[PDB]
Ligand binder design. Sequence first.
Ligand code: HEM
Ligand code: HEM
Ligand code: HEM
Ligand code: FE2
Ligand code: FE2
Ligand code: FE2
Ligand code: FE2
Ligand code: FE2
Ligand code: FE2
Lengths: 159, 158, 157, 157, 158, 157
Amino acid sequence: MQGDPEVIEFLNEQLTAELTAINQYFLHAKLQDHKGWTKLAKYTRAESFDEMRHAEVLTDRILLLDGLPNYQRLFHVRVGQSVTEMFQADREVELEAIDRLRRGIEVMRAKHDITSANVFEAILADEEHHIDYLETQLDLIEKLGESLYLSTVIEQTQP
Amino acid sequence: MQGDPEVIEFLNEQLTAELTAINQYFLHAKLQDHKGWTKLAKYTRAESFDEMRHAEVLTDRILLLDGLPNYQRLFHVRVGQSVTEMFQADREVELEAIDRLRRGIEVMRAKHDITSANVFEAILADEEHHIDYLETQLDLIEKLGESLYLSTVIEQTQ
Amino acid sequence: MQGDPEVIEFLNEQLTAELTAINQYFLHAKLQDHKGWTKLAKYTRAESFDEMRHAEVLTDRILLLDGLPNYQRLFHVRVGQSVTEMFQADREVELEAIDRLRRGIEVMRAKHDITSANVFEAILADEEHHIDYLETQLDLIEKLGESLYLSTVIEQT
Amino acid sequence: MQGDPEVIEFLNEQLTAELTAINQYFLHAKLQDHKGWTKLAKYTRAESFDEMRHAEVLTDRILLLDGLPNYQRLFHVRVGQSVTEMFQADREVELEAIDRLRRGIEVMRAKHDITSANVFEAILADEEHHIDYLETQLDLIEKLGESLYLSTVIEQT
Amino acid sequence: MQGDPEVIEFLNEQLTAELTAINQYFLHAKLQDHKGWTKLAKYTRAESFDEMRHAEVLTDRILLLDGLPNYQRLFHVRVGQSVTEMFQADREVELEAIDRLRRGIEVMRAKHDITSANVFEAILADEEHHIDYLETQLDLIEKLGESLYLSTVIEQTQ
Amino acid sequence: MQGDPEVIEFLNEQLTAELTAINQYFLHAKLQDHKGWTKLAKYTRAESFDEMRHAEVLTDRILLLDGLPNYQRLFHVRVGQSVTEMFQADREVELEAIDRLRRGIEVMRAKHDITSANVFEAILADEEHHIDYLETQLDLIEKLGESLYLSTVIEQT
Ligand code: HEM
Ligand code: HEM
Ligand code: HEM
Ligand SMILES: [Fe+2]
Ligand SMILES: [Fe+2]
Ligand SMILES: [Fe+2]
Ligand SMILES: [Fe+2]
Ligand SMILES: [Fe+2]
Ligand SMILES: [Fe+2]
């Protein structure tokens, strides 16, 4: 058994994407926790862990077909200062990922490979859920007010 | 053995500093708790207890080298009415302490005394963390708004 | 407080090194587990997690001094096919890291910054222990024999 | 509801295949346990039980569509004496099964029947995992050596 | 994102169908329990709850794609007096639902939307099982005998 | 990894010192317990065990740098029949050890070796504490009176 080259190319693209996402999410988690904002930090931390699990599963699969995982590349990473910028960066990344996932699932299942198609289907469902949450939070921030919004996620620790 | 005089002088200065810090912190804790503000009172009480432990360790050390602790002198104490003033006073005190600690560690480890240098290093790390927290809270107050800020640390028990 | 630029440069270099090490270790862990050598996969996973913790500590420190962590670049990554090659790659990486750590600790503690020096001291101790273990295992493989050695790591479960 | 004839034909073929696989795996389990290689007998017994569950599920499905299960015929069964021969026989069987599964899934989902397609997809995933394990063990035997390999599965208890 | 209109139309139709099914099942459960027949009441109650949850999941999905759920329209509801009539009504409803589900899954997965296709696949499996059980019970009633059949689902609780 | 010769020389000196200290402490513990004095025996026993741990740590370290531990030498051992003489011997030994430790830490950390410097720092702290306790007890004996002092560390057992 030896998966065709194009399947491996798509798997490698998705792996690199998930890696860059992991890096971005962890950096944002730290940089938010540093400022006092706590619950946002916890949420982003859990999100990063989930993306880590994604990367692991994709690596295992791409390795089962007699392939060569690519742990050397990385796409551009973005950073922000306020909240709106962080949320917008995350939304952009998720949109790109979803588009790639759909195109790949189509072109792949058109060649009799099924398990990889199922993997992509699961990843797609999860990424869609995540982008939905992001959009909801962004709309909320837009409505309430940046200061009045932040005013509800700042708590003093237990010294 | 018996440590040289300059080491003892530095230890005594640091001891007096920690004592004044304890006094200021407890006064601020009480004066904040009285107004309704609660979580700030808890935090400040904890910090005061930490500085107490600091002073205890420093006095033990300064006494091991055949010295004469100085429990008779205090520096100037500051008080405020709003939150900004309290935080600024605390920040100033911590900055002064940090500078003294660094200079002392240098001049001390340049004379073959190690344990005191380690004590100073620990104290320095702790004061670093504390000044960091103070600056963070001050920036937060600056951004949100004094009233809107206080509006989240008030409470009633009964 | 604002740490001087050179301290930040050294911290960033060490951070990038730890990141590349994490990546290499996890890749090797997976690629070894895939073949049946489980008892090696376990150790390698543990080491990768340790390097993760190292990276987090360095990030926090470099961020406390009003700096700009660099999560964008990586050094070269190496891969092998047998065991000897993996061990040799890891040994090379650790040697480089140790040299950098020593030079940095010196040039740093020469400027009245103590906490970062202590961080580097801890990291150095750990990396030294690890390189020692690697050298021991390599000598053992050299003596016994690749076949014999492998013959005691397979599990069949 | 009445599934078309071709779906039933494919289901019956897969059922017969799983039955022959069950028989082969249990025979090999016994014949290996008899010689002392216990740690292989355990694995083979578990594998046989898994194939048994496969057969049960396929029978239930083929019976829900108003069909006639075929518990009367069997394909050829192979036996060996060493380990390499056993592993090679199992590998051949799994390859054949995988090819049939893929062709069937395609021709089936092209006719608006979904549940059977899902059943085949699950069976395919499992058979693929199994063939992977077989290939790994075969390569390990190739490398170490029959004597060495066998020397780590005898129990004496 | 924004799901195309046809996907939303199919989702709304399926939602309305599941709602009418919920209503019919609960009415039948009550009307059977009232007469003494107990185990049939329990079974129908459980099935009604299942169809409820079905409707809930479909509503959530149709709402995630920026749609407008339709909780205002219902199809026709049927009632009976004996058991045969109830079972036949349920069988008819399930057949219709199955056909709709298949056509929808096809036309939907032909447009790059996957999650909705998976939802429909699950619903289809469940409706398959249910129609199977209905047909089995109907054949059993046909064979044994209506009176002799009922004679085994009565208890002294009323 | 190969520590320079001078570091190894200092480590060996300290190892031999700790060994002689262990021997002296255990001999004194036994010789005190024999006479009826109990709590003194317990204290000295605990101190001997602590010095044992010291020796073990130093041996491990000196062996990590590709060295040759020296378990053949021993410095002159002292013994006294009274109590004051015991305390004075212990005080002398500790003073010598402290001086050596300080000089070694300096000359060592002046050559880019950190872990050994940390080991010496810990040992130095401990020896400081011990000499302090010894001096305190000696002053107490000087004040109260040998008879009075002995009168509070005797039991029936
Ligand atoms: C100090 C706490 C932690 C830090 C700083 C941390 C950070 C990281 C980072 C940066 C990665 C990058 C992986 C990559 O780039 O490929 C990673 C990987 C991973 N971490 Fe952690 N993590 C922490 C806690 C944990 C713990 C405690 C576990 C498990 C017990 C865990 C599970 C994982 C897993 C499963 C991966 C897989 C990465 C991959 O497959 O590529 N994390 N971690
Ligand atoms: C105005 C109120 C207080 C003042 C001025 C005060 C002052 C001090 C001082 C000066 C020391 C140590 C001085 C030295 O070591 O030379 C100390 C030790 C200590 N006191 Fe307080 N104290 C106060 C309240 C309290 C209370 C109410 C408690 C217990 C309920 C308490 C518990 C302690 C503890 C635990 C320590 C030792 C801390 C450590 O070991 O780290 N203090 N106090
Ligand atoms: C005329 C009678 C009833 C109607 C029309 C009705 C309606 C509904 C509907 C439409 C849902 C949404 C369920 C879903 O999303 O799958 C629901 C939820 C639920 N119903 Fe009812 N209900 C009725 C009676 C009851 C009663 C009396 C109970 C329990 C005593 C019950 C048990 C539940 C439960 C447990 C849920 C939770 C749904 C979930 O967690 O997914 N039903 N109800
Ligand atoms: Fe992901
Ligand atoms: Fe302090
Ligand atoms: Fe590291
Ligand atoms: Fe099977
Ligand atoms: Fe339904
Ligand atoms: Fe010692």
